[PDB]
């Protein structure tokens, strides 16, 4: 019973959902296609870059971004939010390497990004991320 539960972030609808998160998911569904494939001893990322016009310089406007020297990240949705997320991930990896010397593990980096994105769904003062991110790489565990 009620209405307007989708007008504010981190507000629970009577069913128990966060409609702003699902609207962000709708925004990511509108984005271009991007895939990741885990092989035996590594990972591969691929992305489709829509040629809006032939005035675009080919092989430029890159979409895949490198974190540390062993993490790859691609995202579908609002590209600037993906750049924000990879910047935060680079900061997290830099802090981890500074304190522990070893390059950040992939599960650790994933949990860092997840906690950041989750904290972006705890307050009505911030908008949820408008990207879905496929990332990963190789560490000591494979």
């Amino acid at each position: 019973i009620g209405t307007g539960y989708d007008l504010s972030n981190s507000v629970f609808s009577p069913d128990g959902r966060n409609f702003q998160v699902e609207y962000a998911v709708k925004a990511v569904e509108n984005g271009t296609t991007s895939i990741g494939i885990k092989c035996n001893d590594g990972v591969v990322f691929a992305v489709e870059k829509l040629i809006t016009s032939k005035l675009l310089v080919p092989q430029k406007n890159v979409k895949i971004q490198v974190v540390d020297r062993h993490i790859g990240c691609v995202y579908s949705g609002l590209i600037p939010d993906g750049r924000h997320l990879v910047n935060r991930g680079r900061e997290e990896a830099a802090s981890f390497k500074k304190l522990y010397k070893t390059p950040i593990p992939i599960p650790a980096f994933a949990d860092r990004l997840g906690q950041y994105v989750q904290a972006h769904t705890l307050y009505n003062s911030v908008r949820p991320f408008g990207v879905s991110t496929i990332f990963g790489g190789v560490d000591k565990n494979g």
Partner: protein
């Protein structure tokens, strides 16, 4: 750092027609004690830069971490990190000198002397110096510590002015560097026999020779020296 503890002694370097040579021993001195044998004081950056660091070893490790992080952050969002946008020696030296001057002005400096040696993209030899005070100067021959007093005059006999740089070859420069290292091992108490040497050549690239040693040591004349003067036998 307010007081240096574990220290490195000297770093020597000289230009030559096709690039630069740099050298530094592998000694970590605990004041008057030569505690750590085998400590690399030459840090290679990319394939075209070498940073020789003398002084506090902890601050040297900090500078190593900073250089590695700079290399990492240069690869970020850069498709030309391999070439045309790779880290140049001038960029690295400017960053290092800015850091040194800032830490000086905050009254907490990095107790180090740094010599940046490399070849630019257009083939020009880059050789520059910075210290805990932020003083920056360039010369065809650059040395720190005891090398600035003893190794410098020898190397300057090879290259006394910029006109002599095209004449000097890699063999002559390497021989001069090895002779200066031998002289330093002779007359420096805080020096070691083992040293490493980097050659940045605009054609062959980066040559990094480790575990080098001082050889051909004249010590025979010591057997004929008897007494503090008056003593005959």
């Amino acid at each position: 750092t307010q007081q240096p503890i574990v220290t490195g002694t000297s770093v020597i370097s000289m230009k030559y027609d096709n690039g630069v040579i740099i050298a530094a021993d592998n000694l970590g001195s605990y004041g008057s004690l030569l505690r750590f044998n085998g400590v690399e004081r030459l840090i290679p950056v990319g394939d075209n830069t070498v940073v020789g660091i003398s002084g506090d070893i902890s601050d040297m490790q900090h500078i190593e971490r900073l250089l590695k992080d700079l290399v990492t952050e240069n690869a970020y969002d850069n498709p030309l990190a391999d070439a045309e946008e790779a880290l140049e020696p001038s960029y690295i030296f400017e960053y290092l000198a800015t850091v040194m001057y800032q830490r000086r002005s905050k009254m907490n400096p990095l107790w180090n002397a740094i010599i940046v040696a490399g070849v630019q993209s257009n083939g020009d030899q880059f050789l520059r110096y910075v210290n805990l005070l932020g003083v920056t100067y360039s010369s065809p021959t650059l040395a720190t510590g005891f090398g600035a007093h003893m190794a410098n005059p020898l190397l300057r006999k090879v290259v006394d002015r910029e006109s002599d740089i095209p004449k000097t070859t890699v063999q002559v420069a390497e021989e001069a560097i090895v002779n200066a290292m031998r002289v330093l091992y002779y007359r420096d108490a805080r020096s070691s026999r083992n040293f490493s040497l980097a050659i940045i050549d605009k054609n062959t690239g980066l040559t990094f020779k480790k575990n080098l040693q001082v050889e051909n040591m004249k010590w025979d004349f010591a057997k004929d020296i008897k007494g503090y003067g008056t003593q005959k036998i």
